[PDB]
Amino acid sequence: IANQFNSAIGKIQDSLSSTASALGKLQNVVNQNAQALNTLVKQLSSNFGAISSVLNDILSRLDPPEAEVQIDRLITGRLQSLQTYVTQQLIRAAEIRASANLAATKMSECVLGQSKRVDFCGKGYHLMSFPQSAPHGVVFLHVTYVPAQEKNFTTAPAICHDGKAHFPREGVFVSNGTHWFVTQRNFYEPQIITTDNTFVSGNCDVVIGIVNNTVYDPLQPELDS
Amino acid sequence: VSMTKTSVDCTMYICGDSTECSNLLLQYGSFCTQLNRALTGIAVEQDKNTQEVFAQVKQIYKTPPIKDFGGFNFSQILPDPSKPSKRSFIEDLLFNKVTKFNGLTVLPPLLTDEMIAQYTSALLAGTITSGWTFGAGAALQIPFAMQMAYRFNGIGVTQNVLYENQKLIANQFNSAIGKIQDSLSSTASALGKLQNVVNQNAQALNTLVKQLSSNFGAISSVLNDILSRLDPPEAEVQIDRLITGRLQSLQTYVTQQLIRAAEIRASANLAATKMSECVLGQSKRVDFCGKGYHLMSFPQSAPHGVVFLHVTY
Amino acid sequence: KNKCVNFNFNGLTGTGVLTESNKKFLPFQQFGRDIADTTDAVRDPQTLEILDITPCSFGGVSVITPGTNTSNQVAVLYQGVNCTEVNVFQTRAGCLIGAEHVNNSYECDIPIGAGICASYQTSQSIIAYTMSLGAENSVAYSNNSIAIPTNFTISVTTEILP
């Protein structure tokens, strides 16, 4: 796992250093804010139905009672240009706020602990996470356990030893074709059946799919002491 | 999950094919260009809201021909292959209980109704045949009678009660799925969350069109009745009032639809969370994946939304 | 009929496409209206016949281009209009020109609409196809079989958040 982990960190340097589009979520933030300001300054060049966009070309050209009308159109146009800017930024801040409340939920649930939420702190069975700062954001490195190599087995919900039904305490029964074994659901670690791995409930004439096999008592060979 | 994608030509709505109007509109700045960018940005989000919800898995799964699920009948949930539209009997009810030329044009969705069901069926076949494993890597075969034995252990119930009472669990389940049909077919108010999403949009569109007939203080709401009636320097005054009024009616529509896309983007991010913690797994969050101790969930599509079927103990 | 023209009637004016339909008007009527106070039908003042009014086709124009570092070959999509002005293919979103349709399904590289997606692939050109949703991996199922992993792998993915 140490070589698997250290090898994976090396891939992060290759992905971040080669593909610059990985941070598209953060570059779209600064770009949208820049388009707004650039569009806000372009509005100053518009006339909005007036004689000219410049105030000096109206005050030093026209009389008071006629300039006050042309001046009013620029104000009414430039004022609405601000309301459209402030209105959008209030909406953009709501999206960034929802993203921060999420990132705080992940820094507490993923980093400061272990998350049992599926596909929240990364795809797979979550072990830990490692934050890395970034401009106007965060970067989480979610470590995950992923089983890869599989093998088909034959299973059963229970085992009948002498009239009593035996269910497993932790894990599931399997079979290599000839013998029955207990094994953890997420990793093949076969073990022999015994009273410590299983528990009894009921009888064999009820459960569906039950089979017949021997349940080993550890105190049996001790009788030959 | 999603909204009706729309886009509005800010030139034809205000200036209905008039050379004099477009010349005056050119002096108002980039209000026209900004409005198209907002709606264009909204319509793109409505395609992400479906990928983040339905496309939780890249690998497609299918049920086996022998539907031996341990007494559980999923026929009303699984798709009907004999139909032309590969949707289940329950999806047929949801797609039936849920019921212009001034520059307004409705863009279509990226994924079609037949594409959504291919995802919704893939998640059912995985939850049935594999359970919680296909949401964490390669799918692992686990029978259904053994799935619930683990899901019963996850809620503080030993797995003796299941195997001893499989006949009761399977009858309670199938009996409950039947009530969902009767409830959806009888009560129309079940799909109210999705019907308001459509009516709220049409109210804004119809109001957008009714604002064209208003005069906004001018002699009339029609351009032909102004350019063909008054002199050039006088028509420019009356036309300037309509352009200022029709333009304020667009900003009110965009500002509303830009807020509604936040309420929908917050609901889609929830449904994506429910399609992961409840469907691809077993949740310990109380009343999140249904009232009671959670066992599993089964999604079903709908027009502009989802419908979960939360099994609880 | 079936041509974008202008309208100058006794009690109606406008611009659009005129065509016969099955609408029925009153004895003293000259023109109808739709739900939103917009005309969509009219009767001939001289003959007894009612002709619907479909406005002339309009729709946004968009280009399907790969990166400029790859090629200058470009296709065009006329959104929401059948093929009028026209390597042509009609979709449920519009008349796509400059792209050759293929029956093979692939992943969506450049979205278009209605399940259609484009891509620059091999003598290279732009293609249009119905996007695939992944390969089928219908797994085995039976009342007695189980899959148990024998190895694992430690993945370290990445997540960006503004």
From Swiss-Prot, chain C:
Changing residue 138 to L: In strain: Omicron/BA.2.12.1. The cytoplasmic Cys-rich domain is palmitoylated. Palmitoylated spike proteins drive the formation of localized ordered cholesterol and sphingo-lipid-rich lipid nanodomains in the early Golgi, where viral budding occurs. Specific enzymatic cleavages in vivo yield mature proteins. The precursor is processed into S1 and S2 by host furin or unknown proteases to yield the mature S1 and S2 proteins. Processing between S2 and S2' occurs either by host CTSL in endosomes, or by host TMPRSS2 at the cell surface. Both cleavages are necessary for the protein to be fusion competent. Cell surface activation allows the virus to enter the cell despite inhibition of the endosomal pathway by hydroxychloroquine. The polybasic furin cleavage site is absent in SARS-CoV S. It comes from the Viruses. Changing residue 36 to D: In strain: Alpha/B.1.1.7. Glycans are attached at residues 69, 82, 103, 122, 143, 151. It is found in: Virion membrane; Host endoplasmic reticulum-Golgi intermediate compartment membrane; Host cell membrane. Changing residue 119 to A: No effect on O-glycosylation by host GALNT1. Disulfide bonds join 4-56, 83-95, 108-117. Variant D614G has become the most prevalent circulating sequence in the global pandemic since April 2020. The mutation is associated with higher viral loads produced in cell culture and animal models. It would not change pathogenicity nor neutralization properties vs vaccination. May be prevalent because the mutation increases virus transmission in human population. Contains sequence and structural motifs very similar to those of a bacterial superantigen and can directly bind and activate T-cell receptors. Activation of a broad T-cell repertoire may be involved in the hyperinflammatory syndrome in acute COVID disease. The KxHxx motif seems to function as an ER retrieval and binds COPI in vitro. Belongs to the betacoronaviruses spike protein family. This is Spike glycoprotein. It comes from Severe acute respiratory syndrome coronavirus 2. The lineage of its organism: Viruses, Riboviria, Orthornavirae, Pisuviricota, Pisoniviricetes. The gene is S. The chain holds residues 535 to 728 of 1273 of the full protein.
